[PDB]
Amino acid sequence: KFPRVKNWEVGSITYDTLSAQAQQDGPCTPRRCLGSLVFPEQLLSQARDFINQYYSSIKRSGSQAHEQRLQEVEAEVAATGTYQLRESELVFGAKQAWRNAPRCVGRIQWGKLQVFDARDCRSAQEMFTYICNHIKYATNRGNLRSAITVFPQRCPGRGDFRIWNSQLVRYAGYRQQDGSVRGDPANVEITELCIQHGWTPGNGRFDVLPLLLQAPDEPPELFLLPPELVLEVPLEHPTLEWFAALGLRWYALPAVSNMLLEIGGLEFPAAPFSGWYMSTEIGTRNLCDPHRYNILEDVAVCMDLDTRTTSSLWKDKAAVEINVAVLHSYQLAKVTIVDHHAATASFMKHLENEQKARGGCPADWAWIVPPISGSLTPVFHQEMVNYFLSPAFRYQPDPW
Amino acid sequence: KFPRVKNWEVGSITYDTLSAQAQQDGPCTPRRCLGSLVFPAPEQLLSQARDFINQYYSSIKRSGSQAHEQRLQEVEAEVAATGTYQLRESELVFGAKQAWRNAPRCVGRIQWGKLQVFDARDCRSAQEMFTYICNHIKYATNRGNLRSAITVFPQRCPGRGDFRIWNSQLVRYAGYRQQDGSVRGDPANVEITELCIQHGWTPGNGRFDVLPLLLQAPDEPPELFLLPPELVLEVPLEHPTLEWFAALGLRWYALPAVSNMLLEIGGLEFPAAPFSGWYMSTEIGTRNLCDPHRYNILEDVAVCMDLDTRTTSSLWKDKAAVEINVAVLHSYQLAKVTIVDHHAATASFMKHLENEQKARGGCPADWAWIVPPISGSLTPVFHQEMVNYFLSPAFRYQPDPW
């Protein structure tokens, strides 16, 4: 009943007792495992259990304020069918939802998160101001700070607050008459929407898209980001002088804007959150994936590698140097970044901390292990258990 | 519906209808996924046997034929009289290929139809067992042009012990528990090393001493057999442009030959059935030489490369690991020993998935084992969603016989 979990480098054994509290159901069955797939009024009951967590979390369970909050939420839903979080409960739910994210390797940071309460928002012009506060605060001139801004919860009968962009900062993706893409291929859909709802297309490879913000029961509105607000890093290499001339750049702040936040039965469909980057996210996935910028062969040609036989490992050598360029360029510009060795070493520490805090830690091995040098990191050798705890971030249908 | 599967590099979508035919259950539940864990009766014999016979007769496009009806009836009668049955030779060849085809953690399954099957079911002693194995090693090594092969020893049957091969692989390097607590040699092989000494093997003291074989005939303690040095093809490691690398004095063996799994065909179980293919270079380069709990040479190579090992942000570990993998591929190709790099291996596996989709409507695959241990997202299988499940016939783990 309690999964035995082994670390093969060390030989250490633990048992995951927290997986018993798995509140929902994942995609796997005894017949088949689907862990590799990317996407695979009684509201009182969720509301009740989250409060118990909260008061247990502050060592005030069954106590005075515990029983009062319970009858409070009961009355609020009885009167309207929904209820309101205390600002502190909102802070706690935000951090827990990060803490419970099985696919995030950055969770050693989960206690330090800046929660911006924006539930008093209405109109997209106010969304936009909340967002620029967030962006300015989180960027902090390159010394990055984690943050989330929470827009009003979904409620019955009412529209919804949605940010149509998947991230707050995204490069455009233009299609050409030869079928291909100039810019970021992942953004061809959001880019044509931006154009169609007003935006004037640039023509470069790193044109920052506008924001398509949507307030309850109106069409979305464009909002162009001030250029001094969006901090970017020109990519250069410590020793390959031609690398800079490739013209590659990326942005400082990874800020995800299209995931739904869920707390004690409440659902916040706009709650963007930001941290800082792991270097492999930029250098390996964003620039070297075949369906993203796909620059691997360009760099290999420039390094004078032999590209007509797979066994010279030219793909591997070019990838490492692109990651070195990324790390060097962010450091040179004093923008917070973390390499996959340091990050995976801190996730090991987080697993050990959580093994003592709550008896385990939900983790998705395929997303924890970095996309280069897998077995050179300690998490490759760590067995992991993936389950869904609440509160949580979840994917959600596109707003169309 | 069946599980919808997506390739993110191409955009394409398939449905894995084959998984619906999964018999034995895996370790996952709707509560929790254990996909990352390494190691998580007459009427059931007949239903497995029946299903296997049906598979065979589909393979040769003779389903429903008279021979198909008669072989089912034949198997039914033998189980009713003896409680077990015997495979025809053709069923055994087909069964061994299907088990390979069904193995979710093997990336080299493009080759599953080209497998040499040695029938050793009439083996009667440990000496005959050793002779079958030397012939296997000789056939498969083939002086460096490796050929896939399996030797099937007699099946488990009631009232008699199993044939077993105590070694996990036919060729392994000794790992000597050093006196100060460390290890000289391969640390993965400390247990089997100590069992060889205790069974009368006089050990050496190198880092690359080939272990002898411990073979167990039914109801008998294991017997010790020395592999003839001329049978064990080994490759000295050198680097194409790092001339000091040869001074490390690194070697690895040509032939990867797994000897401790159980083969299961139509309900029958073969506790000894060693199989061998050829290496993927990351198994030697990354895992066997750079795992911290294996030969753990990564820091030493990095210093000799004059890399800045005092901070992770220079990516010295990645750089050294690449050159170790370069050395392995260069050294095998120089010695004329078959080897495949992880880009070629994973590209051929993508071709296999597409054939299997057309042939059977799916393919069981364990993503964490198919994605190679370096450069994952640079290979195409990284971006391929996969469904993991158990089909039979199958290769299975089994308890250590001691």
Ligand code: HEM
């Ligand atoms: C502060 C430093 C952080 C680092 C280095 C980091 C790193 C990562 C990485 C590498 C992933 C895998 C994403 C991918 O490659 O597609 C991920 C996923 C995720 N992160 Fe973190 N992250 C950080 C902060 C945060 C914060 C502040 C939150 C929320 C409060 C968060 C919530 C999540 C969630 C929900 C996912 C899952 C998204 C998905 O499934 O694609 N992370 N993170």
Ligand code: HEM
């Ligand atoms: C012909 C070239 C072959 C290549 C390149 C190859 C490659 C591999 C690799 C890289 C793995 C992962 C193993 C690890 O990381 O330890 C694996 C596993 C496996 N292979 Fe293959 N293999 C080949 C032939 C064969 C053959 C001939 C068989 C059986 C007839 C076979 C059956 C298996 C099985 C059962 C596993 C999984 C073992 C486990 O669960 O630990 N392979 N193979």
Ligand SMILES: Cc1cc(N)nc(COc2cc(CCN3CCC(F)(F)CC3)cc(F)c2F)c1
């Ligand atoms: C705060 C933070 C820090 C950090 N360092 N990194 C992240 C990245 O978080 C995500 C990354 C991705 C990319 C993976 N992929 C994109 C296309 C797809 F949506 F189709 C499937 C998922 C999707 C998400 F939703 C995410 F939250 C977030």
Ligand SMILES: Cc1cc(N)nc(COc2cc(CCN3CCC(F)(F)CC3)cc(F)c2F)c1
């Ligand atoms: C035929 C063949 C070809 C090839 N190219 N390669 C292989 C490697 O097959 C295995 C290799 C190993 C040793 C590596 N390691 C042992 C401990 C562990 F079990 F924890 C994880 C795997 C164990 C197995 F069972 C295997 F099938 C086999």
Ligand SMILES: C[C@H](O)[C@H](O)[C@H]1CNc2nc(N)[nH]c(=O)c2N1
């Ligand atoms: C198909 C496969 O599940 C998919 O490529 C996953 C695998 N692991 C990943 N890991 C991270 N960190 N990010 C990803 O987008 C993915 N993608």
Ligand SMILES: C[C@H](O)[C@H](O)[C@H]1CNc2nc(N)[nH]c(=O)c2N1
């Ligand atoms: C804990 C983890 O599952 C373990 O280290 C696995 C990961 N993936 C692997 N994949 C392959 N092919 N071989 C392995 O030994 C492993 N080890």
Ligand SMILES: [Ca+2]
């Ligand atoms: Ca045209």
Ligand SMILES: [Cl-]
């Ligand atoms: Cl990104």
Ligand SMILES: [Cl-]
């Ligand atoms: Cl091996």
Ligand SMILES: [Gd]
């Ligand atoms: Gd040049």
Ligand SMILES: [Gd]
């Ligand atoms: Gd040289």
Ligand SMILES: [Zn+2]
């Ligand atoms: Zn699973």
